[PDB]
Amino acid sequence: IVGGYTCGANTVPYQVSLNSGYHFCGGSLINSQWVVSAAHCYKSGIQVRLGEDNINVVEGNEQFISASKSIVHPSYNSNTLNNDIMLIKLKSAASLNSRVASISLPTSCASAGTQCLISGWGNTKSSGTSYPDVLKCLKAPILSDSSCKSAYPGQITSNMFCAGYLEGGKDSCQGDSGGPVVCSGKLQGIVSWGSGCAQKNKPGVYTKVCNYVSWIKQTIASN
Numbered sequence: 001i002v003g004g005y006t007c008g009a010n011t012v013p014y015q016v017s018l019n020s021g022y023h024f025c026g027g028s029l030i031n032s033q034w035v036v037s038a039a040h041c042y043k044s045g046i047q048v049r050l051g052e053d054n055i056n057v058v059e060g061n062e063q064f065i066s067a068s069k070s071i072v073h074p075s076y077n078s079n080t081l082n083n084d085i086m087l088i089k090l091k092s093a094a095s096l097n098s099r100v101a102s103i104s105l106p107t108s109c110a111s112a113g114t115q116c117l118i119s120g121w122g123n124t125k126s127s128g129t130s131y132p133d134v135l136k137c138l139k140a141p142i143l144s145d146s147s148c149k150s151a152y153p154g155q156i157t158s159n160m161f162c163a164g165y166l167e168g169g170k171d172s173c174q175g176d177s178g179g180p181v182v183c184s185g186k187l188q189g190i191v192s193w194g195s196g197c198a199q200k201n202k203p204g205v206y207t208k209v210c211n212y213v214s215w216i217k218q219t220i221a222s223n
């Protein structure tokens with residue numbers, strides 16, 4: 001997260017870290033058994049890390065649980081990142097508590113101009129590289145689809161939306177991949193892609209979760 005702030009420990013209790021010997025993506029807890037992340041975060045051998053603040057220090061509220069299965073959206077296209085969403089099942093249910101909590105799925109989408117919260121452990125510099133070890137937060141509005149498509153012609157689909165600031169300076173970035181965009185208490189986006197990070201007229205692009213709620217609900221009920 002570029003241009004954001006330190007969230008504070010466990011203030012984003014639905015935020016998970018996916019680990020395969022190291023953090024490599026964010027995700028969101030949607031109930032005690034299931035996490036939502038980006039399809040581009042798919043790999044085998046995932047451990048889900050819940051209750052994290054400093055991801056390099058054991059602070060006392062963590063739960064580390066291996067994934068039993070991963071389910072990439074059946075229409076994910078790795079070339080365009082259309083349908084960039086996947087479901088991860090925990091081999092054992094998480095113990096839910098005030099530091100380890102689920103985020104609600106949308107019943108409807110959110111409108112442009114709605115303020116959201118974006119969070120993660122990704123890069124904090126817009127040029128170069130620095131990784132934080134505590135969770136970072138960013139308040140960011142949903143942008144109009146026309147500003148989104150103008151920035152990225154021919155690349156935006158109806159499964160994507162942009163959020164952030166066209167003047168630059170504040171954005172998500174590498175290593176925030178897969179993590180949440182929460183608006184009005186609902187998971188509306190997943191950190192997916194963008195050109196650089198926090199660059200002028202290059203806002204972030206997020207998977208449009210409200211398009212996937214029926215898929216999510218049917219998939220978890222059958223797996």
Ligand SMILES: N=C(N)c1ccc(CNC(=O)[C@@H]2CCCN2C(=O)CCC2CCCCC2)cc1
Binds near residue numbers: 173
């Ligand atoms: N908001 C941002 N600025 C931002 C946030 C997170 C990320 C991380 N995502 C990535 O690195 C993703 C994974 C695969 C290629 N990729 C890219 O962004 C490269 C550009 C992609 C390539 C595929 C189709 C759309 C453009 C990239 C940018």
Ligand SMILES: [Ca+2]
Binds near residue numbers: 054056057058059
């Ligand atoms: Ca920790």
